[PDB]
């Protein structure tokens, strides 16, 4: 009986009503048709529900899962009966009495004690919006009641009980959000479960430092997973590759007890969106654009990547124990990335294109409690990091760590707003000779809001 593992939370897709439609009082009704019977959840969510936690596993959602006939809020319990493809789940909330009712095909679902209340005696707080979660190859339809005649079982149960459609008396369609799996670097909060960041002011003999330590390592609540850390601000190369210092420098210090073979140190471009449980430096996305001539002779070869790093295992092989000092240097006028280990210059070097933003980054698997620290110092003929990042400190030789500089970690899943309109693409097969046709004629635009340092 070989059984495959459970599906990750990153592959479950959450659909949600925007938080500005959250209701704090009244009786509200919506419907959820299950086109493909299977692993789906549907219910009511508080503002503060997260896309990387299963629906109803915490105190932020109250949902019903009809694949197993369960109700979920701060855990799970058994409720109702399992559904079939083509069924309709009617969800009703009564914030006047603080109760929630679920129906399946117009029939009231009941608990093991005969009560029709799936959830009761909750706090209102900010309010609730409709939410659903769909698993692999699952199809569902959420009907909020812009047209109440499109409901299937509203008149059987819900209309005469005082429940109104969620989108009743609304002129435009309710805005929807979905959960997108795109890993992005977010600043480490004070209540982070695994990473603590300490800011150390630069004295006369020591540079300013950002010390990253692990919280739960060495205990029973340890999570020995990969940690992808970045600095908040980038360093940008010059627009043309051809005030006497055009070099920037930063360093990492790996503390004793942390294995250097599990640490990668370097730079990442803004388009790095990779999250994994096992990191390998040979799995990096790389392309090579070769431009030649009419005679088929190669003239230029540009190599592009999104991660320019070195592995500490190669440093150990080339050279508990001692702290390891790894320095990274950038020539901005030439766009040349070079590395050093305890003063000894390494053989790894990279060439980047003009106008390339690079962020300092450390990818590591924690083997101790004090992981590492960013040392934002300087060398001879090498600016500190704050001098290159900030143009106000460009002429200032004193290294600084301004509060805008912070440590960020990879977060895999985020919320993204569903667009109000989509491009109308028509596909057809013209003929066996003419091939397949795509066309798109009606224009569609959006107003993009651009964050400059994140590109």
């Amino acid at each position: 009986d070989p059984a495959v593992e459970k599906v990750s939370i990153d592959k479950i897709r959450f659909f949600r009503v925007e938080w500005s439609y959250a209701v704090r009082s009244g009786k509200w009704y919506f419907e959820f048709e299950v086109v493909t019977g299977g692993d789906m959840r549907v219910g009511w969510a508080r503002p503060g529900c997260r896309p990387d936690i299963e629906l109803g596993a915490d105190d932020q959602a109250f949902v019903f899962e009809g694949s197993r006939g369960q109700r979920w809020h701060q855990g799970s319990g058994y409720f109702g009966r399992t559904w079939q493809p083509g069924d309709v789940v009617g969800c009703m909330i009564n914030l006047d009495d603080a109760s929630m009712i679920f129906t399946l095909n117009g029939e009231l679902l009941i608990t093991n004690k005969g009560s029709e209340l799936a959830f009761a005696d909750y706090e209102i707080e900010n309010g609730f919006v409709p939410i659903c979660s769909l698993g692999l190859s699952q199809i569902g339809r959420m009907n909020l009641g812009m047209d109440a005649s499109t409901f299937k079982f509203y008149t059987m149960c819900g209309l005469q009980e005082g429940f109104e459609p969620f989108a009743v008396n609304m002129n435009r369609d309710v805005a929807m959000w979905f959960s997108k799996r795109l890993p992005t670097f977010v600043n480490v909060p004070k209540d982070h479960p695994h990473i603590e960041v300490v800011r150390i002011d630069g004295t006369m003999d020591s540079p300013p430092c950002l010390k990253v330590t692990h919280k739960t390592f060495g205990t029973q609540n340890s999570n020995a997973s990969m940690i992808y850390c970045r600095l908040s601000m980038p360093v940008e190369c010059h627009s043309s590759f051809s005030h006497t210092t055009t070099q920037c420098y930063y360093a990492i210090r790996i503390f004793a007890g942390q294995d250097p073979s599990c640490v990668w140190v370097g730079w990442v471009t803004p388009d790095y969106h990779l999250y994994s449980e096992k990191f390998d430096l040979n799995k990096n996305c790389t392309v090579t654009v070769t431009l030649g001539d009419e005679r088929g002779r190669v003239h230029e070869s540009v190599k592009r990547s999104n991660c320019y790093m070195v592995w500490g295992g190669d440093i150990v092989a080339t050279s508990s124990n001692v702290d390891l000092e790894i320095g990274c240097l950038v020539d901005l006028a030439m766009g040349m990335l070079s590395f050093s280990a305890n003063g000894r210059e390494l053989g790894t070097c990279y060439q980047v294109e003009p106008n390339t933003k690079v962020f300092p980054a450390v990818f590591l698997q924690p083997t101790s409690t004090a992981l590492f620290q960013f040392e934002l110092g300087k060398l001879k003929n090498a600016m500190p990091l704050s001098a290159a990042i900030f143009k106000s400190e460009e002429k200032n030789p004193v290294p600084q760590c301004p509060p805008r500089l912070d440590v960020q970690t990879i977060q895999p899943v985020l919320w993204s707003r569903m667009p109000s309109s989509f491009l109308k693409v028509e596909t057809e097969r013209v003929s066996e000779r003419h091939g397949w046709a795509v066309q798109c004629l009606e224009p569609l635009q959006m107003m993009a809001l651009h964050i400059p340092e994140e590109n």
């Binding site: 009986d1 005969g114 008149t155 209309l159 459609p165 008396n169 029973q220």
Partner: protein, 810 residues
């Protein structure tokens, strides 16, 4: 100095540690301190020179402290217990109680693969220690002499430890293959003890038949078998039945599924325990109840499909021998009752009919009977069916006391056997029959007759039975005229029609050749109408205890009831019940009007009338509730004058129940005394919870009451096609009912506020103007008084329902 220190500890320190026990919860960072405290207090509990009160104080302190610790912190103490408890010396009550409480409170931590909340999961070392504890205590208690106090406290410890271990736990430590599982070793030990007990019981039976009264040489083994082993087996298969019932096709249990050899062992154990008490009931004496309970719990774990498909020949022969032995015992009982003995009667009453009922219900529920009751087993089932019918339909002294049990067993058999014994004419179209499978030479060798009409000569055919029931229902007969028709023939017919509707003409829109039966929904509708007429005839009689059975046996045929039963059977019966209710309420009110006189006898008469009314209502109401649940959508999509009258009568009865104080009390008393399971009627997953404790008073609740539930289901029929103006009138009338007004005052207020019907023209409710365009009932002239009466009735029903349900939320 030692005695002074003991007084200081047992008077000051340890009572304080007992009172501060809940503060020991959550001490995750203090494992060394808590471990040393537990070791030292457990050492002090084995005191050389302590008084009884001091030792009791130490034991109470240790129990209270360990009751608040998570299982990962108790392991160093359990390592001491795994060495000290299997000695089973004095001062062993406290460690046994500690282990019992720990493994009964924290069973999800060890058993469930998802853990116990945020506590976590058990590691291999903890499960190994748990299994070692179980085997140490079991092997010590097997060789121990009989002590009624030691066994009484060592059995729950074994039940708690066994119920915490996963049944498929493999211990790969010498001194892997599926023989290393815990359930395999446990079943092997039980089977060895069962064979040894069989030999010992045979020797004891020989001693009893010899006439001597000397003590048996194997008294210790018999005491261990009856006082420890049988309750342990019963509780173990109560806890882990879905593990042995599961298969790779259907994952019934989260723990996994048993292997083929484990299911073979379960079937062998059931067969051997059933053969152990085939006539030895008076030999067992008080242990016969435990034996019958263990056989009940083993009859519900039989995965006979896997055993008959992939099993040893001895176990299959044992199952077929069990069925043949049941047939032989029933034939002997029938022959003894026809000729005018006590041992066979007592065994049939207490250890044959309930176990056969459990077996037939188990094979009917899991649909094992199609692949099981074939061939020789089918002939044995034919003999069982003939014996049960002849016993139930006869007129003897024994029959009048055991007719419900015979009817229950016959109805259980009728829903499992895959041949249409009431329709032998079409038996050529049944491929599962022994006549259509075995050659005439084989059936001549077996001795059975070569004609299918000769298998059941004393059982009438389907047409004769249905004509008899129709003639008895249409004649207005009482229960005294037809006891065996109500209590034997009718449940068997209901189960037979429910079984063979699915294998007949109406269930299969393709022909697929001829069918082996002629059962359609017309037969089920006619039989349900006859049942309703029979209940309607015997309304208001003094004693009728058959109603609570006929309300349960008639359920599976209600789903095929035709819509013509509403105007002919349900409405007149409910009208009779409503007239009886209004008469009883009027009599109660006119009795309570007078404050003087001898009102005790009148109060007793009113209470008896209310009890009779509640008995008749709980006879009639489950059928009405199922019929409403099946026909409510069709009533809503096309309203008529019959469903409205049904809602009107149900609302009137519910209002009478709300107003009367004796009505609720007598209904609650009926439900509690007769043990009516309302949730079975109301309901129509996995056993992840163990609710051993139950309360008879918890059987009744206001929310689960059928009188409340009938209105709660028929209220969408009343609240149908209500415009927003009608909803405004209903809200106004509910506000008037909130001020304790009568019906006429509410109707006068509704007459004086008829302008609220203009609220349908308000723009804010304009979304409601097209919701009822599909129904065709929106064609009638406007009448003001009809609207007033309808709104008043709806408002009264809704107000009383809300007033009843408001304290229930709390």
């Amino acid at each position: 100095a030692a005695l002074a220190l003991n007084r200081y500890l047992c008077s000051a320190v340890l009572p304080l540690l007992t009172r501060c026990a809940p503060l020991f919860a959550g001490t995750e960072h203090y494992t060394s301190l808590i471990d040393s405290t537990l070791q030292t207090i457990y050492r002090l509990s084995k005191g050389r020179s302590l008084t009884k009160a001091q030792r009791d104080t130490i034991e109470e302190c240790l129990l209270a402290i360990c009751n608040h610790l998570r299982p990962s912190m108790l392991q160093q103490l359990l390592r001491r217990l795994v060495f000290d408890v299997p000695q089973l010396n004095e001062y062993c009550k406290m460690p046994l109680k500690l282990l019992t409480n720990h493994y009964e409170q924290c069973w999800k931590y060890y058993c469930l693969p998802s853990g116990w909340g945020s506590y976590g999961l058990a590691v291999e070392e903890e499960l190994h220690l748990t299994e070692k504890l179980f085997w140490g205590i079991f092997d010590s208690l097997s060789h121990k002499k009989y002590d009624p106090d030691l066994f009484r406290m060592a059995l729950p410890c074994l039940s708690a430890i066994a119920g915490a271990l996963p049944p498929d736990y493999l211990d790969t430590r010498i001194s892997s293959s599926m023989e290393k599982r815990f359930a395999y070793k446990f079943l092997k030990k039980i089977l060895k003890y069962v064979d040894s007990a069989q030999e010992f019981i045979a020797h004891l039976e020989a001693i009893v038949s010899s006439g001597k009264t000397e003590k048996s040489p194997h008294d210790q083994e018999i005491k261990f078998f009856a006082k420890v082993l049988l309750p342990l087996v019963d509780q173990y298969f109560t806890n882990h039945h879905l593990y042995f019932l599961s298969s790779p096709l259907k994952p019934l249990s989260s723990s996994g599924y048993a292997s083929h050899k484990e299911k073979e062992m379960v079937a062998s154990l059931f067969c051997k325990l059933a053969a152990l008490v085939r006539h030895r009931i008076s030999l067992f004496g008080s242990d016969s109840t435990t034996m019958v309970s263990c056989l009940h719990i083993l009859a519900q774990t039989l995965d006979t499909r896997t055993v008959m498909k992939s099993g040893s020949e001895l176990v299959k022969a044992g199952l077929r021998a069990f069925f043949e032995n049941a047939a032989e015992d029933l034939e002997k009982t029938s022959e003894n009752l026809k000729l005018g003995v006590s041992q066979n009667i007592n065994y049939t009453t207490v250890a044959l009919l309930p176990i056969l009922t459990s077996i037939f219900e188990h094979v009917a529920q899991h649909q094992f009977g199609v692949d099981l009751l074939l061939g020789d087993v089918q002939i044995s089932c034919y003999h069982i069916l003939c014996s049960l019918y002849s016993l139930g339909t006869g007129k003897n002294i024994y029959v009048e006391r055991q007719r419900p049990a015979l009817g229950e067993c016959l109805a259980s058999l009728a829903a499992a056997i895959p041949v249409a014994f009431l329709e032998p004419t079409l038996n050529r179209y049944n491929p599962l029959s022994v006549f259509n499978t075995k050659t005439p030479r084989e059936r001549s060798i077996l001795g059975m007759p070569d004609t299918v009409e000769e298998m059941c000569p004393d059982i009438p055919q389907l047409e004769g039975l249905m004509k008899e029931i129709s003639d008895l229902a249409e004649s207005g007969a009482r229960y005294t005229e037809m006891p065996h028709v109500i209590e034997v023939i009718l449940p068997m017919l209901c189960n037979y029609l429910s079984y063979w509707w699915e294998r007949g003409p109406e269930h299969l829109p393709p022909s697929t050749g001829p069918w082996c039966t002629k059962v359609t929904s017309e037969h089920l509708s006619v039989i349900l109408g006859n049942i309703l007429k029979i209940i309607n005839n015997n309304l208001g009689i003094d004693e009728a205890s058959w109603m609570k059975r006929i309300a349960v046996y008639a359920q599976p045929i209600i789903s095929k009831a035709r819509p013509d039963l509403l105007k002919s059977h349900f409405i007149p019966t409910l009208e009779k019940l409503k007239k009886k209710a209004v008469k009883t309420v009027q009599e109660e009110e006119q009795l309570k009007a007078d404050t003087k006189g001898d009102t005790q006898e009148a109060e007793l008469l009113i209470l008896d009338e209310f009890a009779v009314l509640c008995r008749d209502l709980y006879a009639f109401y489950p059928m009405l509730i199922r019929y409403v649940d099946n026909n409510r959508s069709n009533w809503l999509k096309s309203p008529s004058a019959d469903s409205d009258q049904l809602f009107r009568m149900v609302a009137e009865v519910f209002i009478l129940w709300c107003k009367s104080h004796n009505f609720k009390r007598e209904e609650q008393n009926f439900v509690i005394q007769n043990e009516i399971n309302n949730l079975a009627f109301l309901t129509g997953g996995q056993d992840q919870e163990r609710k051993k404790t139950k309360r008879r008073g918890d059987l009744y609740s206001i929310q689960t009451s059928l009188i409340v539930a009938a209105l709660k289901k028929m209220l969408p029929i009343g609240l149908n096609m209500c415009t927003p103006g009608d909803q405004e009138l209903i809200s106004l009338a509910k506000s008037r009912y909130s001020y304790r007004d009568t019906d006429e005052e509410v109707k006068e207020h509704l007459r004086n506020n008829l302008h609220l019907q203009e609220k349908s023209d308000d723009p804010a409710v304009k979304w409601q103007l097209n919701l009822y365009k599909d129904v065709l009932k929106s064609e009638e002239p406007f009448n003001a008084e009809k609207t007033i009466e309808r709104v008043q009735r709806i408002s009264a029903a809704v107000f009383h329902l809300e007033q009843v349900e408001q304290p229930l939320r709390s």
